[PDB]
Design an enzyme around this catalytic site. Structure first.
Site: not given
Ligand SMILES: NC(=O)c1ccc[n+]([C@@H]2O[C@H](COP(=O)([O-])OP(=O)(O)OC[C@H]3O[C@@H](n4cnc5c(N)ncnc54)[C@H](OP(=O)(O)O)[C@@H]3O)[C@@H](O)[C@H]2O)c1
Ligand SMILES: O=C(O)[C@@H]1CCCN(S(=O)(=O)c2ccc3ccccc3c2)C1
Length: 305
Positions: A45, A50, A79, A112, A200, A204, A253, A259, A261-262
């Site tokens: 993703d 990014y 996106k 996005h 998240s 997150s 992420k 992590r 691999r886990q």
């Molecule tokens: N559409 C949008 O607006 C949007 C918004 C937010 C995110 N996203 C997408 O969603 C992806 C994932 O969400 P996110 O970035 O918010 O993070 P997330 O998946 O909630 O991960 C949160 C933190 O958990 C840690 N983690 C991962 N596996 C773990 C484990 N087994 N044990 C304990 N910690 C672990 C990671 O740190 P470490 O790196 O140290 O392991 C990461 O920084 C983003 O990277 C992006 O591709 C999209």
């Molecule tokens: O897609 C991701 O991982 C980005 C992480 C950091 C910034 N955001 S973003 O597009 O600025 C963003 C910021 C605030 C937000 C608040 C509520 C819902 C979505 C949001 C996206 C997405």
């Protein structure tokens, strides 16, 4: 383990999340993406936001060129950024993402967010015209599938009720986890054959630009910890497994080898109905992204509760 999308293409149910803050070098994205594919992630993703599409594309191409996977075993998402909502801007932004990544096509393109921004403060844009433009990208073969992200239910209905709709969104990628489980929205997506994709899902990154550091840390939750000990897994793994058993596609992420691999172990165990109920009891309307910089945007998604 894949799910069938509503346009007949397939999405793997676990994805690798590639976003890292600007304090982490660009170069790290190449290396962890490789590790991801090596551990067994086939859904990667990314986005224009990014500023890592070149490294994620390189990582993918490198793992194809070393023979480990074909193109077709990879599901790559990108996106459309929010400055590019006006319809004449949509194909050029996708073409731009494709060239950064040095791929012929994306498996998935998403809007996005619904919160349009001036190209290049807020903008007003009819998101049905954006969507028409996303459809032409699919008709051109630039994206296998098209979808939305950060839409609430009513914003989804607007596209689904559009005169002359050609393609429904295949998914809606939204914030989703045990403190904000989106079950009503999930029920609505299911009734329409739209996949909910959870971001998240592990609580997150808690970046100070958007997340209050006073918020509870999802992976310190005491019920997830007790479940982790009952199953001799980890709290991350419990959060991931909950989503798969609710019919939700889950991103994870991590920029750490172990992590990464886990996380693929989510496929190796099950939760019981009582476990799933204890997790459903954590829901407390906690969206970790909660900032003044979007909270009063005209199409803020969390205005509908
Ligand atoms: N559409 C949008 O607006 C949007 C918004 C937010 C995110 N996203 C997408 O969603 C992806 C994932 O969400 P996110 O970035 O918010 O993070 P997330 O998946 O909630 O991960 C949160 C933190 O958990 C840690 N983690 C991962 N596996 C773990 C484990 N087994 N044990 C304990 N910690 C672990 C990671 O740190 P470490 O790196 O140290 O392991 C990461 O920084 C983003 O990277 C992006 O591709 C999209
Ligand atoms: O897609 C991701 O991982 C980005 C992480 C950091 C910034 N955001 S973003 O597009 O600025 C963003 C910021 C605030 C937000 C608040 C509520 C819902 C979505 C949001 C996206 C997405």
């Amino acid at each position: 383990q894949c799910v069938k999308l509503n346009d007949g293409h397939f999405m793997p149910v676990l994805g690798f999340g590639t976003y890292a803050p600007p304090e982490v070098p660009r170069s790290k994205a190449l290396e962890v993406t490789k590790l991801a594919i090596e551990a067994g992630f086939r859904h990667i993703d990314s986005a224009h936001l990014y500023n890592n599409e070149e490294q994620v594309g390189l990582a993918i191409r490198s793992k194809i060129a070393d023979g480990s996977v074909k193109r077709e075993d990879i599901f790559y998402t990108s996106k459309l950024w929010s400055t590019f909502h006006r319809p004449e801007l949509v194909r050029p932004a996708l073409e731009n993402s494709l060239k950064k990544a040095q791929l012929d096509y994306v498996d998935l393109y998403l809007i996005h967010s619904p919160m349009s921004l001036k190209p290049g403060i807020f903008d007003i844009v009819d998101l049905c015209t954006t969507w028409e433009a996303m459809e032409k990208c699919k008709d051109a073969g630039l994206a296998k599938s098209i979808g939305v992200s950060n839409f609430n239910r009513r914003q989804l209905e607007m596209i689904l009720n559009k005169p002359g709709l050609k393609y429904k969104p295949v998914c809606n990628q939204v914030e989703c986890h045990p403190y904000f489980n989106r079950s009503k929205l999930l029920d609505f997506c299911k009734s329409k054959d739209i996949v909910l994709v959870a971001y998240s899902a592990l609580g997150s990154q808690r970046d100070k630009r958007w997340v209050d550091p006073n918020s509870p840390v999802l992976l310190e939750d005491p019920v997830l910890c007790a479940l982790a000990k009952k199953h001799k897994r980890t709290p991350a793994l419990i959060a991931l497994r909950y989503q798969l058993q609710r019919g939700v596609v889950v991103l994870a992420k991590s920029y750490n080898e172990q992590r990464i691999r886990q996380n693929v172990q989510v496929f190796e165990f099950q939760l019981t109905a009582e476990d799933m109920k204890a997790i459903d009891g954590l829901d407390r309307n906690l969206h970790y992204f909660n900032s003044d910089s979007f909270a009063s945007h005209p199409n803020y998604p969390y205005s509908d509760e």
